[PDB]
Write a protein that binds this DNA or RNA. Sequence first.
RNA 1: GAACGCCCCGCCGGCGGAUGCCUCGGCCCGGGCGGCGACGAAGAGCGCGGCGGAGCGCGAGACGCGGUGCGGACCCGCCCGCCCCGAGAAGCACCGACCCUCGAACGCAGCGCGCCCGGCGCCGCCGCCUCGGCGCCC
Length: 154
Amino acid sequence: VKYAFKSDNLLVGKSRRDGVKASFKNTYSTCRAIKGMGVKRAFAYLDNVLNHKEIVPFFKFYKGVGRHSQARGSGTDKGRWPEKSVVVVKDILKQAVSNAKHAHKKEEDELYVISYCVNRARGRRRRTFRAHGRISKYESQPCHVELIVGPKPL
RNA sequence: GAACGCCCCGCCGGCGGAUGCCUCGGCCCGGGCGGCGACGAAGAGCGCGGCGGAGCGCGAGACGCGGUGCGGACCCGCCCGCCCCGAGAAGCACCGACCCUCGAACGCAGCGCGCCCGGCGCCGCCGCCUCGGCGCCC
Ligand SMILES: [Mg+2]
Ligand SMILES: [Mg+2]
Ligand SMILES: [Mg+2]
Ligand SMILES: [Mg+2]
């Protein structure tokens, strides 16, 4: 699809992935948790989620997400450690930093995460069997993911 | 407080397939025509292309063969082939043939078997061959 970020007087690095086989709600929260970070920080932070040293806070899709001790100062008490969404976002981040560090020779020490947009895509459609002869749906909820890197926001 | 939610002050993305325009199709009326079959029909099965599934077509001569006319440069891919005052690609019309199994379906059965060395089903009409009767007579 097309890009949702339209700025025209910044030097940016961009990458996207269309139709990602990962939960939409999990992946939205992972991208919103790294917004505004410098790209050194977000790369460490994402490796810590993999190792259960930090959490992803959940501000939008949280009914049934458990409260945990690792989320004390964030604004909420709820979070999780989505391992498959962190695998996707890390690889999309590296393309955008490569795209920027190669089009204009800017270091990772002045790059920041300044935009994101997650959108709902069209899923795989299977079926499950219910009692008394009935059939029901069993679908996936995939996503489109985009991520922009550039200079410190102000 | 922030956030969630809600409204839109506006700028962009998704999901979905409405609206508009388009149409080798339907529907209605009128005119023709009225042309199947034991010389094996209608229908069914199986098989047939250099690379070939479906549908059209064809029948072991199988994605076609011949004859008379016409036509005159191509043959959707990859190849082949044709090319010329006739040498002949596409296309068209009539005519002659080929025409596996089942089916009115015809040696019996439906996939297996015979009688006889041509062959070998039922009904009816007309003839003919060979015959029966303590029918009527001689
Ligand atoms: Mg069940
Ligand atoms: Mg049942
Ligand atoms: Mg075929
Ligand atoms: Mg027969």
